[PDB]
Amino acid sequence: KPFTVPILTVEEMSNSRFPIPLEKLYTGPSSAFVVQPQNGRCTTDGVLLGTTQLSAVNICNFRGDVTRVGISHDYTMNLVSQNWNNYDPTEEIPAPLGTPDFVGKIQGLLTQTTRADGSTRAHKATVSTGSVHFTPKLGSVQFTTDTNNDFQTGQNTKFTPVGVIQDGDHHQNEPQQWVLPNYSGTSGHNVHLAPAVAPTFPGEQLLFFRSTMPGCSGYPNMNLDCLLPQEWVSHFYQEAAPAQSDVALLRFVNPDTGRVLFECKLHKSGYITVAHTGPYDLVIPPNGYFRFDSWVNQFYTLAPM
Amino acid sequence: KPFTVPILTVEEMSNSRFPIPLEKLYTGPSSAFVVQPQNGRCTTDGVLLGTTQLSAVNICNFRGDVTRVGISHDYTMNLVSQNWNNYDPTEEIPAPLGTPDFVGKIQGLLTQTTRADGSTRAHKATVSTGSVHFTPKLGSVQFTTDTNNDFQTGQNTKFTPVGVIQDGHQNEPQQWVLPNYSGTSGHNVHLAPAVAPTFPGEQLLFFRSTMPGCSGYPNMNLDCLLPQEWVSHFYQEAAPAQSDVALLRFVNPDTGRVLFECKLHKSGYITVAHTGPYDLVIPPNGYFRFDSWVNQFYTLAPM
Numbered sequence: 001k002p003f004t005v006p007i008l009t010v011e012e013m014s015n016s017r018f019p020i021p022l023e024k025l026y027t028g029p030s031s032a033f034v035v036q037p038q039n040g041r042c043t044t045d046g047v048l049l050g051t052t053q054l055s056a057v058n059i060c061n062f063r064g065d066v067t068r069v070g071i072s073h074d075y076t077m078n079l080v081s082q083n084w085n086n087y088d089p090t091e092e093i094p095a096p097l098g099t100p101d102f103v104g105k106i107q108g109l110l111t112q113t114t115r116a117d118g119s120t121r122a123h124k125a126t127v128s129t130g131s132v133h134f135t136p137k138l139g140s141v142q143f144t145t146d147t148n149n150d151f152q153t154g155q156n157t158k159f160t161p162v163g164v165i166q167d168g169d170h171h172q173n174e175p176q177q178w179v180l181p182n183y184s185g186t187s188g189h190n191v192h193l194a195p196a197v198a199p200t201f202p203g204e205q206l207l208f209f210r211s212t213m214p215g216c217s218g219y220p221n222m223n224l225d226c227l228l229p230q231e232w233v234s235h236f237y238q239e240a241a242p243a244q245s246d247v248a249l250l251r252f253v254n255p256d257t258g259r260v261l262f263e264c265k266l267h268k269s270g271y272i273t274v275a276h277t278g279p280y281d282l283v284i285p286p287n288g289y290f291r292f293d294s295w296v297n298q299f300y301t302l303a304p305m
Numbered sequence: 306k307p308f309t310v311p312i313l314t315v316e317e318m319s320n321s322r323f324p325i326p327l328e329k330l331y332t333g334p335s336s337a338f339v340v341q342p343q344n345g346r347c348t349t350d351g352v353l354l355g356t357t358q359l360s361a362v363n364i365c366n367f368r369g370d371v372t373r374v375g376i377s378h379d380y381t382m383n384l385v386s387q388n389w390n391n392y393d394p395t396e397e398i399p400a401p402l403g404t405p406d407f408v409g410k411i412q413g414l415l416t417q418t419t420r421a422d423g424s425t426r427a428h429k430a431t432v433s434t435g436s437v438h439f440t441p442k443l444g445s446v447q448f449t450t451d452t453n454n455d456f457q458t459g460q461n462t463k464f465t466p467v468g469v470i471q472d473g474h475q476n477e478p479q480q481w482v483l484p485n486y487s488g489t490s491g492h493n494v495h496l497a498p499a500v501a502p503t504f505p506g507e508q509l510l511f512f513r514s515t516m517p518g519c520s521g522y523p524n525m526n527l528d529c530l531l532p533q534e535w536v537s538h539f540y541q542e543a544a545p546a547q548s549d550v551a552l553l554r555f556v557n558p559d560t561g562r563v564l565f566e567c568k569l570h571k572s573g574y575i576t577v578a579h580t581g582p583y584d585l586v587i588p589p590n591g592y593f594r595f596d597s598w599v600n601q602f603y604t605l606a607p608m
């Protein structure tokens with residue numbers, strides 16, 4: 001089965017690490033980080049990795065029942081699955097599919113319906129994924145909310161993420177997009193992780209699909225880079241085209257002129273490298289798209305960006 | 306190019322009318338009312354219709370600058386596009402792509418960044434699409450928010466939708482009543498067509514989600530004609546339609562057994578042979594498979 005990537009333009013696609021559109025292509029140095037995201041991870045032959053699932057609308061969402069922590073404005077959510085069935089901690093994944101894969105304070109609305117009478121409610125809420133109470137692998141996370149009394153026990157509750165917050169004099173100190181949470185808190189180390197990725201070939205860097213997360217309070221670092229658009233994850237999962245070598249050579253083309261703007265290496269394990277050093281917002285026509293041209297190896301020397 | 310539909314299961318897909326996952330399949334009568342959604346509209350050969358665009362995460366989102374209405378808690382948003390560029394009201398679409406296509410009060414967060422210093426803010430906010438101030442085709446909508454002073458002028462502002470509210474039970478939203486995209490100033494234009502079965506014994510098949518409820522007693526059902534992933538698939542594939550009707554079989558790969566068959570009409574909606582309201586019962590790995598081009602007079606096996 002011939003391998004292909006989607007023909008959608010960058011801005012027609014979705015970030016695979018938060019439910020927001022892509023904005024641009026970005027390359028930068030990654031030696032200062034361990035780049036090990038768990039969402040947006042999929043092999044070119046369609047094997048999902050980490051905590052990756054198939055739709056952007058589920059990323060960083062949570063569902064379950066809630067109970068108030070003491071007499072505070074915090075609530076513990078006992079997680080269930082996307083379709084409201086019981087969560088299974090025994091599954092060989094790091095955490096429920098779609099769980100946030102960075103340390104940060106994600107703000108959104110926590111909503112609830114009372115089944116018996118159809119009454120509903122919503123409150124602004126934040127989940128701090130660096131908190132010791134962020135234990136999604138164990139089946140629970142904690143939210144700080146704007147209420148201490150309105151949520152009912154035993155009722156279906158959903159968190160819909162919107163953006164991120166920051167607090168402190170050191171501006172843009174959080175979120176930390178390349179620091180994984182401890183999915184089981186202090187109780188144990190992370191398990192079943194998709195591997196870290198790094199360029200190995202001289203002169204190469206990762207290519208990122210970049211968005212700006214909405215900021216909700218303070219001075220957050222709003223950059224969010226994913227390794228694959230969500231639509232590529234879905235495409236590979238469905239097509240399941242066999243990888244005929246370790247690397248798929250892609251050309252980024254202007255469809256109007258037919259000219260190649262740059263070329264890159266899509267590694268079969270699901271990430272892209274380009275030949276560039278330093279931070280660079282790629283200059284591209286908005287109708288540009290990626291095209292698979294041939295199967296190559298990890299030592300293929302790209303035309304420099 | 307051979308026509309195909311995605312192999313994703315229902316719960317792996319997204320509603321094309323609000324940024325939430327699909328939950329289930331429903332069929333029912335719809336003779337007594339107009340079915341004319343504007344999001345989730347695409348022909349099988351990839352022509353987008355109505356206000357349909359390509360990703361679910363953009364649906365019912367709004368962007369622009371805001372100005373306070375008087376000294377109230379309401380703010381007017383002067384709309385821009387998904388990437389902060391111009392919206393052209395003269396483009397022959399009903400309203401900006403992704404605009405809500407139902408009358409209801411949508412609640413979410415209105416967020417803002419101050420360009421100069423990177424300070425940010427968020428407030429609970431509702432857009433009433435039945436309001437006279439819901440005029441997206443004119444380039445503006447109005448939000449009621451939980452602040453009367455925190456939003457700044459001339460700064461990028463985004464509404465992220467979460468769910469719906471009600472006042473008065475389940476009388477709103479009205480998912481099949483289109484808002485007036487130009488308010489009282491003009492009638493709706495450039496709409497994707499209304500849809501109905503034409504063959505006796507058939508009903509529409511709906512891809513159903515439940516919108517989160519945020520206050521009161523809202524009607525939370527939300528039915529779309531095509532999953533968002535089908536819109537994106539057809540747009541990219543652009544496979545020619547060999548007839549006006551594609552026969553799909555819904556298959557359980559666990560058994561190879563066909564659960565039911567249905568007609569995917571070229572103009573982008575599905576019918577089944579059934580009379581009455583019915584919540585379909587489907588296996589977890591079930592999916593749709595295109596088998597052949599037929600015609601409007603093909604009789605489906607009863608669903």
Ligand SMILES: C[C@@H]1O[C@@H](O[C@@H]2[C@@H](O[C@H]3O[C@H](CO)[C@H](O)[C@H](O)[C@H]3O)[C@@H](O)[C@@H](CO)O[C@@H]2O)[C@@H](O)[C@H](O)[C@@H]1O
Nearest residue numbers: 167216217218219419423424425426427428452455456
């Ligand atoms: C930088 C600052 O971020 C946000 O303000 C927060 C404060 O937020 C609280 O009050 C503000 C209005 O002053 C607003 O009503 C917000 O909803 C509410 O949570 C507060 O958290 C303090 C604590 O030190 O930090 C910031 O000042 C934002 O509202 C401001 O516009 C501004 O961007």
Ligand SMILES: C[C@@H]1O[C@@H](O[C@@H]2[C@@H](O[C@H]3O[C@H](CO)[C@H](O)[C@H](O)[C@H]3O)[C@@H](O)[C@@H](CO)O[C@@H]2O)[C@@H](O)[C@H](O)[C@@H]1O
Nearest residue numbers: 114118119120121122123147150151472519520521522
């Ligand atoms: C049916 C009812 O809907 C929601 O309540 C609203 C009220 O909402 C206001 O106060 C409530 C707490 O009582 C909550 O703090 C909410 O955020 C706030 O807007 C209010 O709008 C009244 C006015 O008619 O209608 C409802 O009572 C929800 O909060 C309740 O839990 C309940 O489901």
